[PDB]
Each structure stands twice: as structure tokens, then as C-alpha cells.
Ligand binder design. Sequence first.
Ligand code: UP6
Ligand code: UP6
Lengths: 211, 239
Amino acid sequence: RLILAMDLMNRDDALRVTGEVREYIDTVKIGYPLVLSEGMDIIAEFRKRFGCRIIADFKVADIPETNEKICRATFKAGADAIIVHGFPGADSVRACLNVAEEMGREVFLLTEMSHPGAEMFIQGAADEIARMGVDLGVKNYVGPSTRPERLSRLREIIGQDSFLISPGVGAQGGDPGETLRFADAIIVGRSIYLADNPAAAAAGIIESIKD
Amino acid sequence: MDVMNRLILAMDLMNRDDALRVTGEVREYIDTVKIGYPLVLSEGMDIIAEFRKRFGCRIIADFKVADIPETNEKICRATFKAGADAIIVHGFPGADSVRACLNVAEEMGREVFLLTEMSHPGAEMFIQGAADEIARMGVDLGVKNYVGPSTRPERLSRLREIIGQDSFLISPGVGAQGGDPGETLRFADAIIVGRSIYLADNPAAAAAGIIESIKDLLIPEDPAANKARKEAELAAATA
Ligand SMILES: O=c1cnn([C@@H]2O[C@H](COP(=O)(O)O)[C@@H](O)[C@H]2O)c(=O)[nH]1
Ligand SMILES: O=c1cnn([C@@H]2O[C@H](COP(=O)(O)O)[C@@H](O)[C@H]2O)c(=O)[nH]1
């Protein structure tokens, strides 16, 4: 139920920290901070070193044709799943779903974001974006740990069978406990990777989850 | 900003050899190339530094930045360090996310382009209804470079009205998506073209033909003269 957001930007530190918390997590979310600094080959390296599943948090948000290319390149690099924005509309999400279905991979639809700015435009479109996901056959979603009430509303729309993961825990102030009342797993980055003892930080979170 | 021939190449080929060959075939016609994730994820960010060493062209990184503030800052820093002159950012995630990009660009002496409304059909679902507010947010934040759709010139004129003539506006959707350069360049300062050039049997010939079509529009090269021309185009559009 704990996914590591590995946003360190150099290979040595990213590999070291992930290795230190490997016993506590089996899925690592890798985004552009690490990929743009070290290359897409870092995904294969993580899989070789840790045997973990990799979610590419690329916030895909282009036209359909470009989205297809991004998804193909990301799955060829070995990612198990990719995070896609829904605000650009249904055709753009469908382009990602088509490639994921062809390659046996997964699309996670980001319905509402966790930061303050999310309230400006995303929040008002969130329920509609989630219903669009349901209509498109999306089974994996991302929602905000910082707004438990919004997270419960999202869970209502997507149903109990869909998988929901949630960022914003720790640094952004979301609570592991309340978040896991609705989400299947929480994403944690800085609270673990900025710590002098990341293993102890991750163990602490796991403790809270067990409890 | 002023781009040679008002034409920006969208280089979305996915392998280095072809990307460098096609850009080399058309470089005499442009001074600005837009590089996005199809090429960067396939060949690495080092491809930007390679283009900067190989050609005397400005590089706009079309990364559609759309994350939380802290992650946006990291993305922008890595992108500018790699050599990009500018980066394209989404406004839908909010003002704090755009401000994070502007702060890094200011610190590093680079530029941010704010994407206000997209060119594809799906843009009508959520983005179009937020676009004017996103453009006003850009004005409030001091953004001076914008991206708007060639596929909806009426929407592009409204965007120009909001951002004013002292902001730079570029527009994709010409060629493959059917946008009209003429109506588009009544409002935008430059058009972005990808597939119509890079999938052509002769990219140089395709680029040269588009440039002839742009010259047929008789758009002044002189900044003040095109500012007056654009003011009249907008006044006519709103009259
Ligand atoms: O709504 C969202 C979507 N994605 N992320 C991402 O999830 C991670 C959360 O990291 P943190 O624990 O360090 O805040 C980062 O990679 C960030 O880009 C959010 O924080 N909020
Ligand atoms: O609203 C937008 C924003 N960006 N792009 C991008 O501009 C280019 C247009 O390419 P094309 O001429 O091949 O359609 C591609 O890189 C695409 O991702 C659009 O097409 N529409």
C-alpha cells in the first residue's frame, strides 16, 4: 500500500535510496525529474536492481497522436503503467488506452491533483473527468490525499473494484490513515527520500499503515 | 520574440538519425525548432544539447509541464540545463504550478510559453471553457509567450485580445490537423508545423511551400508594422 515517488535527480542517489527502502515497497513511481536527468534507461535499471513494478508519472497531456508516441516509448522502455491527465479530453485519454491495451500495460487517470492550484480549474472538472474514465473503461486512478472528502467522492464514481492511488502524503500534508480509507495505496516521495534515514522513514509509514 | 519566416518546426520523429537529417534539410528556412517528448524519451535529453551544437536554432521544449509546483521546478531546471531556450507549460493545473516554472525561467534567463487552448477535438471538453481564464492568469503572472490553436481562429482572436500585441503567440495545428495559416497569422506571430514537413517525401520542399504560402499573405517583417496590422485584424474580427 506504499508506492515510492522517486524524484531524486541523479542516478547514484536514486538507486541508493530506493535500495535502502526496497523491503518496504514493491512499486516505484518514476517521473520526469529522474528521467530527464538520467534517461529512460533508468527504468530498465530499476527493474533489474529491484524487481519492482514501475509507474511512469509523465502526466501525459498532449494531442492524441503525440500521446500515442509518448506511451509507446514509455512502455518500450519497460514501464508497467503511465499516469495520464484527463483535462485534455477523451480522445487524448483513449490514445493512451489504445497503446496500453496493445502492450498489456496500464493507464492511470489523474482526476484531481493534490496541490493548492488544483482548486482553480481541475477540481471543478474532476467528477466529470472521473466519469469519463469510467465510460472509457479506465480501471486505475489517481486522486488527492490532501482532500479526503474529494477522494471519497472519486471512490463513489469509480466503484470499489477500480484501483486508486494517492499522492500528497507527508510533505503536502495528506494523512496516510484517512487517505487509505478510500485509496488502495499512497504515494510518498520527499518524506522518505529527503530523510537522512530513508529506511527508517519508510518503516515509520508502514507502521502507521499496519496500525 | 521574432521567429524566422514565422515557421517553427515540430520535430517529433523518434530517432536521432532521422530527426537530425530532416532538421538539416529544413534549417535554411527556420531559426526555431520545437522538440517534445516523442524525440526526448526515445533519444534522451542529450538530444537537445546535440541540436544546439549542430544547428544555430532556438529550441523550444514542448513538455506540456503539468505537475505540482515542486516537480515543475525540477522539470524546468533540468530542461534549461540541457540547453532549451524555452519550455511549454500547461495552465490547467493552476497559478502556483505556472509560477514555479516562471521562477526557474527568470533565474536561468530562459522563457516560458503558456499553453492556453489546445488544437485537437478533445480540447472542447474541458480546456476550451477554461482557456480565457488561463490566458488572463498568464497576463496576471507576467507571462509573455503563449500557445493557441490554429484550428479555431475565432478562439485565437479572443486569446490575442486578452494577451495583447506585446506578447508572442505561436500556433500548432497547421497541416495534419487542417488549420489555416492565413486566418491563423491574422492573430498569431508564428505557426508550428510537424507532420506536413517531417513526413513529406521531401521535407525541404514541404517547408519551402509553406513559406511561400506565408509570404503570399504579405505580413510585415517589421515588428511595429505587424503590430498595427494585427491590431486592425483584431478590430475587424471584433467589429
Ligand atoms: O496530484 C498530484 C499528482 N502527482 N503528484 C506527484 O506525486 C509525487 C508526490 O511527492 P511528495 O511525497 O514528495 O510530495 C511527486 O512526484 C509529484 O509530482 C503529486 O504530488 N500530486
Ligand atoms: O494544442 C496543441 C499543443 N501542442 N501541439 C503539438 O504541436 C505539434 C503539432 O504537430 P503536427 O503539425 O504534426 O500536427 C505536435 O508536437 C503536438 O504535440 C499540438 O498539436 N496542439
